[model samples]
Target: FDVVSCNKNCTSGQNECPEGCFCGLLGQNKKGHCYKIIGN
Candidate 1:
């Protein structure tokens, strides 16, 4: 899994995760990282 920093907004929230990727939480912050899921 690859981890990358991303921006997080509730009101105007946007997905920073790449196409097919998913956004997730880290520790204690709104913005988190992006992870790509492989293998069906």
Candidate 2:
């Protein structure tokens, strides 16, 4: 699996994340995966 911050350097928002973060499993134009920060 891959881990990253989010797109556009947004770590906290409705659907915006840093360029290397997860953008959840849904959302149009999404470019990453939403990973649980405290689970394996």
Candidate 3:
């Protein structure tokens, strides 16, 4: 299994995460993953 997983997928730095989070590179993936800004 992968070390981490995202709730939703995003692109070009777009935010797919809820208001508590933002979009960012979570791993070595080419696409962007929803990351947390305030909490994880």
The best candidate in terms of lDDT? 3
- Candidate with top TM-score is 1
Q: Could you give candidate 2's per-residue lDDT for residues 4-38 as a string of tens digits?
A: 44334223335555433445644454344444343
lDDT of 2 at 20: 34
TM-score of each: 0.42, 0.22, 0.40
lDDT of 3 by residue, 1-40 (tens): 2233447777654545666555666553556766544323
Over 4 Å off, model 1: 1-12, 26-29
lDDT minimum window of 10 residues, candidate 3:
1-10
Model 1 error, position 12 (Å) = 8.2
Alpha carbon lDDT of each predicted model: 0.50, 0.43, 0.56
Q: Compared with the true structure, what per-residue lDDT tens digits does model 1 show for residues 1-40?
A: 5454443322115546556666665443555556655543
Give candidate 2 misplaced runs (Cα > 4 Å): 2-14, 25-40
Q: What's the C-alpha lDDT at position 33 in model 3?
A: 63
When 1 and 2 are scored with lDDT, the better candidate is 1
Query: Where's the lowest-lDDT run of ten residues in candidate 1?
Result: 3-12
Indicate the residue-level lDDT of 27 in model 1: 44
Candidate 3 TM-score, true structure as reference: 0.40
